[PDB]
């Protein structure tokens, strides 16, 4: 199935910047600051002395805009890519992909390295089409390690079933409000994300109340909600969801196109997966892991053209 010269989706998951606050005793908040050195300037960000802990704050929407293509000139390519989402949700369901995205929120995977050397950290979720009594995860390092520990929370059903209904409905919304509480040691190393300079360390910052403050990248944050990809051959580490899925530590592509399991080689078998899903025999684990990865690239968005 040849790819058009105009194809594009939008992302269904939309994060925001991360704001760093400092909670003194007497329970008041002040945005965290950092330094700047010249003699090539390197910025250093560490907790002040009298602080008690640290808040973080952002917001994610499961917009569910992966239901139909954003722009697609060929109507045969459009009618196929609509039928996979209606067949994935009927034969497999959004329960496996809703749980893996939501664990990355509900533990601190979006807190990249600031988790390291902490005493305890907690997450509190404020879901929007919701009744009340905000969902709170307490003491994640000891209480929550395995997935089961999340499912023993009193409302883990009721929040996966938002993200499913947000992906199932043609206008589904599901806004979340995440807030963390890191109990560091005294004068702790905190690592924010940092700008790109043509070539020593300049942080990405914003302005919160007339003062500079380090902000985790909006793009930096969605790259940790999307660490789901562990469907590659001989998989050990889960990867960030992408086409021909890279690993930036050891600068190599797993799912290289010579493996046959990058995204574009699975899109060309999109008609092939419609006959497998429309039988009655439940398909193999090898051929639904190809479908979990195929849906995670429509949730990611992008442009899928050729020629």
């Amino acid at each position: 199935m040849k790819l058009p010269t105009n194809l594009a989706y939008e992302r269904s998951i939309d994060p925001s910047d991360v704001c760093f606050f400092v909670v003194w005793p007497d329970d008041r908040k002040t945005p965290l600051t950092y330094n700047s050195r010249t003699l090539h300037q390197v910025d250093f960000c560490h907790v002040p002395y009298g602080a008690s802990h640290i808040e973080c704050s952002f917001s994610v929407s499961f917009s569910s805009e992966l239901r139909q293509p954003y722009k697609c000139n060929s109507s045969k390519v459009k009618q196929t890519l609509v039928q996979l989402v209606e067949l994935y949700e009927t034969k497999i369901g959004w329960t496996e992909l809703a749980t893996r995205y939501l664990m990355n929120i509900c533990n601190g995977k979006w807190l990249w390295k600031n988790t390291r050397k902490a005493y305890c950290w907690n997450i509190v979720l404020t879901p929007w089409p919701w009744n009340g009594e905000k969902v709170g995860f307490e003491d994640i390092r000891t209480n929550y390690t395995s997935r089961q520990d999340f499912k023993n929370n009193k409302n883990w059903s009721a929040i996966v079933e938002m993200i499913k209904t947000a992906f199932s409905s043609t206008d589904g919304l599901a806004i979340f409000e995440v807030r963390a509480t890191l109990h560091l040691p005294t004068n702790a190393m905190v690592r924010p994300s940092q700008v790109f300079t043509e070539k020593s360390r300049v942080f990405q910052s914003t302005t919160i109340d007339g003062e500079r403050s380090p902000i985790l990248g909006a793009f930096k944050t969605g790259a940790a909600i999307a660490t789901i990809d562990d469907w590659y051959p001989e998989a050990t580490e889960p990867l960030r969801v992408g086409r021909f899925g890279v690993h930036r530590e050891d600068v190599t592509c797993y799912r290289h196109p010579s493996t046959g399991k990058d995204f574009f080689s699975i899109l060309q078998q999109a008609e092939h997966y419609i006959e497998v899903l429309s039988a009655n025999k439940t398909p193999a684990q090898e051929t639904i892991n190809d479908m979990h990865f195929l849906m995670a690239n429509l949730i990611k968005g992008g442009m899928f053209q050729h020629k």
Binding site: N35, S36, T38, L39, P48, Y49
Partner: protein
């Protein structure tokens, strides 16, 4: 004399020679010597360390046996730089606590005009520090 380093980490190699000079001023407890870095480039120290006012002492004999040795300005220690690094800004609060720490803050724009560092340690304890040396 004027010592020539002929291989080279001169910065870290010149710094061991002062550790002998650190220890030799406790066996005899003098301070009658001077320190002079002639080739103080704006990048390195240079392969010339010189003592002005050694050559027969225990460290420099085995250094000289191998094929590599030959054996105004103000070179002063500047430990005001040591408090600019932000592990010392919180030591300095616990000093001055003896009150609101939250009304103290950072500097957020500092510009350090050509310091220079040579890393060393203690020998009573197991504790490291820096010999900050400028003109």
């Amino acid at each position: 004399k004027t010592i020539t380093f002929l291989p080279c980490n001169n910065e870290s190699l010149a710094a061991k020679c002062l550790r002998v000079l650190h220890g030799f001023n406790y066996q005899y407890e003098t301070r009658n010597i001077g320190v002079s870095f002639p080739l103080w480039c704006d990048a390195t120290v240079g392969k010339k360390i010189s003592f002005v006012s050694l050559l027969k002492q225990h460290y420099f004999v085995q250094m000289e046996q191998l094929q590599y040795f030959h054996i105004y300005v103000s070179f002063r220690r500047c430990q005001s730089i040591d408090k600019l690094t932000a592990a010392g800004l919180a030591r300095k609060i616990r000093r001055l606590e003896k009150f609101d720490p939250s009304s103290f803050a950072q500097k957020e724009h500092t510009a350090i005009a050509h310091y220079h560092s040579l890393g060393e340690s203690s020998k009573q304890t197991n504790r490291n520090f820096r010999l900050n040396i400028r003109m």
